[PDB]
PDB file of C-alpha atoms and ligand atoms in Angstrom:
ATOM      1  CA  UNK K 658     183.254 -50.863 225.730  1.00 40.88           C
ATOM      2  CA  UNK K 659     180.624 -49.637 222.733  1.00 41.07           C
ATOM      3  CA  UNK K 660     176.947 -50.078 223.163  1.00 39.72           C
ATOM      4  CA  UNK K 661     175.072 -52.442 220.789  1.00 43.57           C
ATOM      5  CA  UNK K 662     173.750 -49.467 218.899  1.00 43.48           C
ATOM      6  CA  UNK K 663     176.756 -48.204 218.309  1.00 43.10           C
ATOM      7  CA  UNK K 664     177.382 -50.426 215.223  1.00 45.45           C
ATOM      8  CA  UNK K 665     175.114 -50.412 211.860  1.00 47.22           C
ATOM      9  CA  UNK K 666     172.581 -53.332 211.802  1.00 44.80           C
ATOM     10  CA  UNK K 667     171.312 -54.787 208.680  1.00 46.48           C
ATOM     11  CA  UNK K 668     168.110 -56.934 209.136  1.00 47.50           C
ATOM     12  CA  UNK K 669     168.608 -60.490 208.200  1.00 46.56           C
ATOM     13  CA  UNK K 670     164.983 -62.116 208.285  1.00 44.36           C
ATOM     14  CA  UNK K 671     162.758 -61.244 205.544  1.00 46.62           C
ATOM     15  CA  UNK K 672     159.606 -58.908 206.777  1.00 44.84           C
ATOM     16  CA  UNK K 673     156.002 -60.386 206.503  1.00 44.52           C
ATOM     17  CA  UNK K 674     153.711 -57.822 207.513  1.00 43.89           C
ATOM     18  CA  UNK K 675     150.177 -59.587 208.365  1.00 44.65           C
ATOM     19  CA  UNK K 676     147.046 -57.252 209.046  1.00 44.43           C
ATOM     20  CA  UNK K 677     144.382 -58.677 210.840  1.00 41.12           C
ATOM     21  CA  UNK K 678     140.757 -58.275 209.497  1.00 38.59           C
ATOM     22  CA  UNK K 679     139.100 -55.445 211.509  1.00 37.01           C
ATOM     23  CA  UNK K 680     136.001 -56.134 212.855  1.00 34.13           C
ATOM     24  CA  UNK K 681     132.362 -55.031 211.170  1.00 35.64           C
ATOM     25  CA  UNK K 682     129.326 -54.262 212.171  1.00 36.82           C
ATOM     26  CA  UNK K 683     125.905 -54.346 210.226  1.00 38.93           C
ATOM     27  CA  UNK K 684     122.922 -52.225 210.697  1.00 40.98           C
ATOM     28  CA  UNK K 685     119.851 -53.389 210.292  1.00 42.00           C
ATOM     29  CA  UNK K 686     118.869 -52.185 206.201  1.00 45.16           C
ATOM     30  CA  UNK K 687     115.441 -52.425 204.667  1.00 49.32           C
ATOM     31  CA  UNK K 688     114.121 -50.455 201.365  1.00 48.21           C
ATOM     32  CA  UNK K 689     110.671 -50.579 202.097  1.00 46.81           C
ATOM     33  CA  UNK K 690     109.274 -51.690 206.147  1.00 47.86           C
ATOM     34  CA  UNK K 691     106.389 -53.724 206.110  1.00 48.02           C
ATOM     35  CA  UNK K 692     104.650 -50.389 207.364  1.00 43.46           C
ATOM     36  CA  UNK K 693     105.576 -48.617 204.168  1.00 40.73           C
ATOM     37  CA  UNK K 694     104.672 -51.712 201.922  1.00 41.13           C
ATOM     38  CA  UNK K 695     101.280 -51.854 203.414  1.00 39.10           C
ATOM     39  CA  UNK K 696     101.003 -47.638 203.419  1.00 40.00           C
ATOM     40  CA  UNK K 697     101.869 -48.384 198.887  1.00 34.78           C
ATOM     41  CA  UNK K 698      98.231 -49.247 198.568  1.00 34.45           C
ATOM     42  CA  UNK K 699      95.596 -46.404 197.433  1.00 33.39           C
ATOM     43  CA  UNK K 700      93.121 -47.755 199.960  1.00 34.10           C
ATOM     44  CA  UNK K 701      92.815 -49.778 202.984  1.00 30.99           C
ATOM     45  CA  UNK K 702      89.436 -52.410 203.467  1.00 31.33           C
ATOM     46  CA  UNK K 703      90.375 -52.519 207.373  1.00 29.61           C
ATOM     47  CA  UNK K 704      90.265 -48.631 207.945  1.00 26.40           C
ATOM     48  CA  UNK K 705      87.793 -47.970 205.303  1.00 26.06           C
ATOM     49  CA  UNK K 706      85.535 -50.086 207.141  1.00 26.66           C
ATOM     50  CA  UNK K 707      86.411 -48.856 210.372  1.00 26.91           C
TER      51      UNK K 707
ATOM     52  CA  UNK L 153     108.311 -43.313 195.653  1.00 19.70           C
ATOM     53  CA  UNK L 154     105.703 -46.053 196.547  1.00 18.93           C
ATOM     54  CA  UNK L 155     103.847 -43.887 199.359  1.00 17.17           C
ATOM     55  CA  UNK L 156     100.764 -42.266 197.831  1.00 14.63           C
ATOM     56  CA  UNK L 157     100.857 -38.515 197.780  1.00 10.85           C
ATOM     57  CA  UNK L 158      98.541 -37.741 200.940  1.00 11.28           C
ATOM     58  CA  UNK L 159      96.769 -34.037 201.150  1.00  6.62           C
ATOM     59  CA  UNK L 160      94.299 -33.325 203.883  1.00  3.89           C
ATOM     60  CA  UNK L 161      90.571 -32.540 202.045  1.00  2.00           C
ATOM     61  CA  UNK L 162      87.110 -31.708 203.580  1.00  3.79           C
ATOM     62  CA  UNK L 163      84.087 -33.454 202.050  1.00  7.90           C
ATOM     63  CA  UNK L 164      80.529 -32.129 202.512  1.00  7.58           C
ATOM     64  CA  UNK L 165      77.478 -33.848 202.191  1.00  6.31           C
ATOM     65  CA  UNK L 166      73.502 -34.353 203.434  1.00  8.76           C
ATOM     66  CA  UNK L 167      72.155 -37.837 204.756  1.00  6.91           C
ATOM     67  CA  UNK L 168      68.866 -37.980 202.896  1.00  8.73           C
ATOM     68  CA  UNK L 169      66.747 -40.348 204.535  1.00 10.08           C
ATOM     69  CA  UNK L 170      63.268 -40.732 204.063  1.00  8.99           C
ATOM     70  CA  UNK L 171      61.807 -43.707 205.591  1.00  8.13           C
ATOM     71  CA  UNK L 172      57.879 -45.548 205.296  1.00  8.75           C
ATOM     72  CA  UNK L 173      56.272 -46.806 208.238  1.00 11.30           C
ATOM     73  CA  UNK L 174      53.020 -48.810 208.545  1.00 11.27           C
ATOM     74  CA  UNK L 175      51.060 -48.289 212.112  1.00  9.90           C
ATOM     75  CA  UNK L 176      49.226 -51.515 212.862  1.00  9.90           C
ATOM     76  CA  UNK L 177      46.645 -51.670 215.244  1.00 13.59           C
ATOM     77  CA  UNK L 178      49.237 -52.903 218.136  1.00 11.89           C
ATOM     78  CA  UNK L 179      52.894 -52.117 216.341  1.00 14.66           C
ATOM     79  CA  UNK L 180      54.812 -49.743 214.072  1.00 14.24           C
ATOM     80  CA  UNK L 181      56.759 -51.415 211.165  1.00 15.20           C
ATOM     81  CA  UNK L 182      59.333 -49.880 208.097  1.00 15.32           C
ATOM     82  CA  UNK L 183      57.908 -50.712 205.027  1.00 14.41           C
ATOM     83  CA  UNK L 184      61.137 -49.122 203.358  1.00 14.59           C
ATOM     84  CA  UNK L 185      64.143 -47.108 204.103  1.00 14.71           C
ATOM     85  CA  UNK L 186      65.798 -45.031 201.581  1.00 13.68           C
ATOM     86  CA  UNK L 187      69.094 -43.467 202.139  1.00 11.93           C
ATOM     87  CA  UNK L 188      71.105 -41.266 200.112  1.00 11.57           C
ATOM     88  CA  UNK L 189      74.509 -38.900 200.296  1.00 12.21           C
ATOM     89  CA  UNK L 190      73.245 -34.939 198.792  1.00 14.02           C
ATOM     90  CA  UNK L 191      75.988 -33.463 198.015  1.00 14.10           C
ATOM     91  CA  UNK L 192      76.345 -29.660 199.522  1.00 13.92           C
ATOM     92  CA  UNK L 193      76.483 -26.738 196.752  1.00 13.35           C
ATOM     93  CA  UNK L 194      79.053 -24.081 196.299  1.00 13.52           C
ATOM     94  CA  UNK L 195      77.089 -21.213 197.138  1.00 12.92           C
ATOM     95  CA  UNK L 196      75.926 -23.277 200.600  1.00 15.02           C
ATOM     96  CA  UNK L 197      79.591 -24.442 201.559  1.00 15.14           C
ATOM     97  CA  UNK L 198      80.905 -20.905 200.958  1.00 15.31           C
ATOM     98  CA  UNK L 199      78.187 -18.545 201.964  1.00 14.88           C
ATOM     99  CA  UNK L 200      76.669 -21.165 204.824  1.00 15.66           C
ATOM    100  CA  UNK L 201      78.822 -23.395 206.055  1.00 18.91           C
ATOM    101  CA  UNK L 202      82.221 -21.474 205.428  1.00 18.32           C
TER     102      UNK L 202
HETATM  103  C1  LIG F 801     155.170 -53.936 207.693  1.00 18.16           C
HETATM  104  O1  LIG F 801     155.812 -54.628 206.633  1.00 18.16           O
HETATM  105  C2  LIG F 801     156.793 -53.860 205.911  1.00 18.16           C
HETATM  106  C3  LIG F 801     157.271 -54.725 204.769  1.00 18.16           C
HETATM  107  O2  LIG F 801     156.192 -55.053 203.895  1.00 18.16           O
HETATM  108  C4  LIG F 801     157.910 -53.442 206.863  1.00 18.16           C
HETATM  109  O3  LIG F 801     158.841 -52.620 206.166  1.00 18.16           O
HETATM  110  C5  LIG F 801     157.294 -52.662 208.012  1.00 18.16           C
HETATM  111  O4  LIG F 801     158.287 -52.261 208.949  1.00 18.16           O
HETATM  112  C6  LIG F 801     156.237 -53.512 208.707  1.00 18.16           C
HETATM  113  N1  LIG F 801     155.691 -52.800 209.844  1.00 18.16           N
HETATM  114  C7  LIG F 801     155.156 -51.578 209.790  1.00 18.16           C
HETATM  115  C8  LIG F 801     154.711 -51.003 211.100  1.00 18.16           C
HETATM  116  O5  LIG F 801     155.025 -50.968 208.734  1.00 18.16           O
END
């Protein structure tokens, strides 16, 4: 008696390899805040008034 | 860049205010008000103030 090993084995079916789509996660991304936007101007009417 | 370059500066200056009044014979009135920003000299910012 001869284990199943024992003997060379040739793969019959025809390999598909399939790789899932990993997950992602996106960070929140701005180029200019609304802080910054409103820090562009040269001067501000509410704190020069103030 | 769209944040303005920001330094730290020291202004110096007088509140000239020279004011009329009119005494009536029961009340006190201004009859005109006259206000103006004197700026402070070199000599009195460095030798005075500084
Ligand atoms: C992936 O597919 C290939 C054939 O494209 C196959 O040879 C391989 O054994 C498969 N599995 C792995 C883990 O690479």
């Amino acid at each position: 008696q001869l284990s199943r090993a024992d003997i060379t084995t040739v793969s019959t079916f025809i390999d598909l390899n399939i790789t899932m789509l990993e997950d992602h996660e996106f960070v929140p991304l701005e180029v200019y805040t609304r802080h910054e936007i409103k820090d562009s101007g040269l001067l501000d009417y509410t704190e020069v008034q103030r | 860049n769209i944040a303005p370059y920001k330094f730290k500066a020291t202004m110096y200056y007088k509140d000239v205010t020279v004011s009329q009044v009119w005494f009536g014979h029961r009340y006190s009135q201004f009859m005109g008000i006259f206000e103006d920003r004197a700026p402070v000299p070199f000599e009195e910012v460095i030798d005075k103030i500084n």
